[PDB]
Design a protein around this ligand. Structure first.
Ligand SMILES: CCN(CCO)c1ccc(N)cc1
Ligand SMILES: CCN(CCO)c1ccc(N)cc1
Ligand SMILES: [Zn+2]
Ligand SMILES: [Zn+2]
Ligand SMILES: [Zn+2]
Length: 453
């Protein structure tokens, strides 16, 4: 039980307003045949165009919401909407394009999917709220067959070209006209009462219904993200490395150790209250401080209410990726900014985003008002390690934010210049990934200079 059986029943009630008289009894096998696709009894890696919810969750990076609305049925034009915000009008002869025949529309579809997905996934998963026209449009821009490899590289083929009779991945499909072996899932198969808008609006107020196909496509994908990543969470599922995951994660641990160590040296808190991940380890194990841990799993729906985390109840509080409505004034905070544009950050539900780095984390919408009792933490590098080289060429470092014994003495040593530059790169990596750092208002790096006396 890893793939969806073609002999599984498909509920057709949602399809009957576009396809009246459709049989109530139907399998994926008959549906695919009626869609105009021939599977020919083929065991060549593509057993079904449709996938299970479990397979869709593993390929969340491939998700593209797709809706088709009748503009006027082979006689009338269709409006194709995608969760990228693109609307294309195909004539049978928030960006809205004028009516064009399928031979040119299919070229635009391939270009758009390739530009969106090349740095995200090895495939496309059309996320539908199927009513009929969207499935009947597929024969006009999709070709299927055995699993193939790209003609210019080792990646699986996602596109086909009728001009050259060749196959390409999302990176090498320029000039290609067909989407090859796409996958799809109909959200209506999961069991819902009422229409798309009524189910979507129960959980999200950010996506409106401007009455166009792309709005429906965005709502459909948003509803699926809510069902799979908000109301249900699975932190065991592993996702492949597609970018700077490792460097970001290493930078996060380096920055956390730096900031907490410096806050303890500068303000000498007798106790640190570490709130968040129940598997947390002391980030500054050599510090004198009394370290107390409080368990809170990552919140995927709404930010935690501080009144609930503290059970309505000195030292400093550490909230490292623990999303709360309003941080206490005595805090050290790392909060992911959901607005960040990156290949790891997918659009989410109700302003939230789906951050995918080894595991998927639906993160509640970034809110500047959560940080009203704090200030932004400025960049600084602190080190009490010996000034000694051991082991790239050099230009002497001059920086007011290199808090070291050698800088206090008037000339930064080669070791601390190298470590400062490595730390600044890690810091910039973490910030550009979307993380934001906040600290108690009394934090002052000037208090770190007397640790070298
Ligand atoms: C959704 C696919 N489709 C439209 C033509 O491709 C269709 C499905 C079932 C029946 N019985 C007739 C038509
Ligand atoms: C900020 C630390 N703190 C008060 C110390 O006793 C606290 C934290 C969590 C709960 N649940 C209660 C209290
Ligand atoms: Zn390729
Ligand atoms: Zn939404
Ligand atoms: Zn030094």
């Amino acid at each position: 039980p890893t793939h969806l059986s073609v002999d599984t029943k498909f509920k057709t009630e949602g399809l009957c307003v576009d396809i009246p008289g459709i049989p109530k009894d139907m399998t994926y096998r008959r549906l695919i045949s009626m869609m105009g696709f021939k599977m020919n009894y083929q065991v060549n890696g593509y057993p079904n165009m449709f996938i299970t919810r479990e397979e869709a969750i593993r390929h969340v990076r491939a998700w593209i919401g797709f809706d088709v609305e009748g503009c006027h049925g082979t006689n009338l034009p269709l409006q194709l909407g995608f969760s990228t915000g693109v609307n294309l009008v195909a004539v049978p002869t928030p960006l809205m394009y004028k009516g064009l025949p399928w031979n040119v529309v299919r070229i635009k579809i391939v270009q758009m999917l390739s530009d969106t997905l090349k740095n995200l996934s090895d495939r496309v998963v059309f996320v539908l709220w199927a009513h009929g026209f969207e499935l009947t449009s597929m024969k006009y821009f999709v070709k299927i067959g055995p699993e193939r490899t790209c003609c210019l590289c080792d990646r699986r083929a996602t596109c086909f070209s009728t001009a050259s009779d060749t196959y390409a991945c999302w990176h090498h499909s320029i000039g290609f006209d067909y989407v090859y072996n796409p996958f799809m899932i109909d959200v209506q198969q999961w069991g819902f009462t009422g229409n798309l808008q009524s189910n979507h609006d129960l959980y999200c107020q950010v996506h409106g219904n401007a009455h166009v196909a792309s709005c429906d496509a965005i709502m459909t994908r948003c509803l699926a993200v809510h069902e799979c990543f908000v109301k249900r969470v699975d932190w065991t599922i592993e996702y492949p490395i597609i970018g700077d995951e490792l460097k970001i994660n290493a930078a996060c641990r380096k920055v956390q150790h730096m900031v907490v160590k410096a806050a303890l040296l500068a303000d000498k808190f007798p106790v640190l209250h570490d709130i968040g991940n129940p598997k947390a380890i002391k980030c500054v194990p050599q510090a004198d401080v009394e370290w107390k841990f409080y368990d809170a799993q990552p919140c995927s729906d709404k930010a935690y209410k501080i009144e609930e985390l503290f059970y309505s109840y000195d030292g400093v509080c550490l909230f490292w990726n623990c999303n709360v409505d309003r941080y206490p004034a005595n805090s050290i905070v790392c909060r992911f900014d959901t607005r960040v544009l990156s290949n790891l950050n997918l659009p989410g539900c109700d302003g939230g985003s789906l951050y995918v780095n080894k595991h998927a984390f639906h993160t509640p919408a970034f809110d500047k008002s959560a940080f009203v009792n704090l200030k932004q933490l400025p960049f600084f590098y602190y080190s009490d390690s010996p000034c000694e080289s051991h082991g790239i060429d050099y230009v002497p470092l001059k920086s007011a934010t290199c808090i070291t014994r050698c800088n206090l003495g008037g000339a930064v040593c080669r070791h601390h210049a190298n470590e400062y530059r490595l730390y600044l790169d890690a810091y910039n990596m973490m910030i550009s990934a979307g993380f934001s750092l906040w600290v108690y208002k009394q934090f002052d790096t000037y208090n770190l200079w007397n640790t070298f006396t």
